[model samples]
Every structure is written in structure tokens, then in C-alpha cells.
Target: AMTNNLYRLELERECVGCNLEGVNLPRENFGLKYRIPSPLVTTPFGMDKAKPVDLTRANLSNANLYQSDLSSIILENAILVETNLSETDLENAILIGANLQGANLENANLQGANLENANLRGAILTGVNLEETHLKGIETDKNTVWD
Candidate 1:
């Protein structure tokens, strides 16, 4: 009975151009509560085949995803404009061609993250961890704030 909800809609379809603005999907000790039976995997996987959360071409603009464990997630060409990702663990995250314009990434762990061809225009990345983070062909404006 929760039709028209963008959050539910994202779970329903493949979420091509999904609008999840301001949705707080932080991963906070949920493993102890409920077993993750989520199509929120954003892609497919098999038993014991640990695959990445493929959020390819999804629109997660303005979402509050602070401290979320997004390690090895595939966010290729996704729209993450103005998203709150403070202290988020993005180790080995595939953000190729993602539109991260104006996103807040304060102190976020980006070790081994692939940001190739991503849009960093006006994005905030103060004190962020950048161990081996790839930045090849990324788009950044004069307002792109970084540490």
C-alpha cells in the first residue's frame, strides 16, 4: 500500500534514473537485527558469490548516506549530487562517470576507490582518505573543495 514512494520504487524496478533524494540509508548495525534480504543489492548475485551493489545509473541525489559501508559497490554513472557521505567507507567503490556534484565527503574513506571520469564539481572532500584512489579524467570545477 506504499505506492509512489521513491524508496519503494527503487526497490521495485531496476532504478534507472531513480530519485531517492534525502533518503537515509546508512548501514548501522542492521546485521544483528535483520538478515539482508534486499534487492537493494542493485544487481544480481549467487549463493556465496559476494558481488558488489551495482547502482549503475541510479539517481541518489541529496541522500543522507553517512557512514554507510559502500565498500566495493559499483556506482557507475550514478547521480549522487549533493549527497551526505561523511565518514562513509567507500573502499574499492567503483564510481566511474558518477555525477557527484556538490556532494559532501568529509573524512570519508576512499581507499582504492575508482573515481574515473566522475563529476566533482563543487563537491566537498575535506580530510577524506585517498589511499590509492583513482581520479583519472574526473570533472571538477573551480568550486570543487578538497583537502
Candidate 2:
């Protein structure tokens, strides 16, 4: 039985690069637990970079990340349903293929974050910083959160 569990673990590990739920720190310093995949080049290093810790696909559903520092983290293809990211610092974060449905990002700092192909349906982003963040191929609606 353990063999099957081990095999499953290996399979999951191969599929996903990293997980961050186990990391511990001050609630105010949430992003510090994140470690960018090596060769951390911006807009050029490609997928060889580090995997995300707290924001895995579907793991962060309904999680609260408001007022946290998530600077320079990669969150591509993450599910952020009803999550609170208000006033969080997401400067230079990569969000390709990320899902932000019903998330609250009001007054968040997203300066230079790449959000290409991200799903922003029903997400609230009132006063969020979007300097140099990619918006092409992303899905968003007027009811979605925006400043």
C-alpha cells in the first residue's frame, strides 16, 4: 500500500514542481516563503524557473492573501476563487494561465506583473497596480474587480 502511495507521490511531484502550504512565517510576510525557480530571469528564463509554494493549482481556492507581500513570485495557472489579495504586493509576479475567479485584489500592488492568459472572471481588482503587467489573452468582465 505504501508503494502505491510512494508512486503517487512521485507522480504528483513530477507533475508539480513545488508546494508552499508547509512554509511558516509571520502572517504579514507571506511571500517570503516563496523561492523563485532557479535561473530567475524575467520574461526570458522560461519554465526552468522555480515553482510556486502557496499558490498551486486548486490548492489556494478561497484562500486569503490580502495585505501580504507576494513580490516576484510565479503564479501561473493558479486558482484564486474568492481569495482576498487586497493590498498585497505582487510586483513582477508571473500569472500566465492563472485563474482569478471571484478573487478580491482591491488596492493590490501588481506593478510589472505578467497576467497573460489569466482568468479574471468576477475578480475584484480595485486600485490594483498594473504597470507592465501583461493583460493579453486574459478573460475579465465589468463585474469583475477593477479599480
Candidate 3:
């Protein structure tokens, strides 16, 4: 009966070695248990260059990516409203125009990360390491935790 799930195909395509560039995936919930594939690359002797997972402009609202390793990932214009990004490694990641309202980013490593125009309204940022991070045009309210 779960075949009717629209995200089922997209979720399945999120496997290793899958290319999901420029795909629109708004409001796909991962139940707080989804784990992004680890960063890995393989260059075979007679094959094209393999790439890591790319989710540009993907909508991940209400998705749970707790403790996910998303370092060096490109999330430009991606919608991440109410997403769980606690303890995630986002070092050197680009998040231009990414919406993070009410998202939990507690203890996340965001060193050297670019967050230009990203919304952090009511988002939790406790214990987050934001050393050398770009915060220009970032929208944040009083409810946003920055401890």
C-alpha cells in the first residue's frame, strides 16, 4: 500500500552513485532517521569521473537529517524548513538562499560555511561552530539560539 508514496521513487533514487542534480523535492519527510551517503569517489581506469551526491535546489522541508555528514555539499536555493540538522557536519558547505526556519542545527560544525540569504528564524543553533562562516543577509529572529 506504500506504493502510492510520491517520495518513494525519489528516496530510492537517493542511493549510492545516483545523480539527482536540479531535482525538485519539496516537503519530503525522512522521519528523522535518514542518513546521507558518506562522501566517496571512485576513479576507474576506463570510466567517467564518478561524483558524490548532489541535491541542488531540492526541497527537504520537515525532513530529518540528524547527525548527517553533509560536508562540502552544495545546497543552493534548497528549502529546508523545519528540518532536523542536529550534529550535522556542514563544514565548507554552500547554503545560499536555503530556508532553515525552525530547523534544529544544534552542535553542528559549520566552519567556513556560506549561509548568505539563508533563513534561520526560530532555528536552534546551540553549540554550533560557526568560525569564519558567512552570515550576510541571513534572516534570524529572537527565537534563534546561537549559543
lDDT of 2 at 99: 81
Better of 1 and 3 by TM-score: 1
State the local distance difference test value for candidate 2.
Answer: 0.64
lDDT of 3 by residue, 34-102 (tens): 333433332224323323344567777777677766765667777778777888878878888888888
Looking at model 3, report the run of 10 residues with the lowest lDDT sum. 26-35
Model 1 / residue 59 / CA error / Å: 0.5
Predicted model with the maximum TM-score: 1
TM-score of each: 0.75, 0.65, 0.67
Candidate 1 yields a Cα-based lDDT of 0.75
- Local error of candidate 3 at 1, Å? 14
lDDT for each candidate structure: 0.75, 0.64, 0.68
Deviating ranges (above 4 Å) for candidate 3: 1-52
Write candidate 2's Cα lDDT for 1-147 as tens digits.
445433433343221333323222223433433433333432424535544333435335666665776776667777666677788888877777888788888888888888898989999888887888778898988778565
Q: How big is the positional error of residue 108 in model 3, measured in Å on the Cα after superposition?
A: 0.4
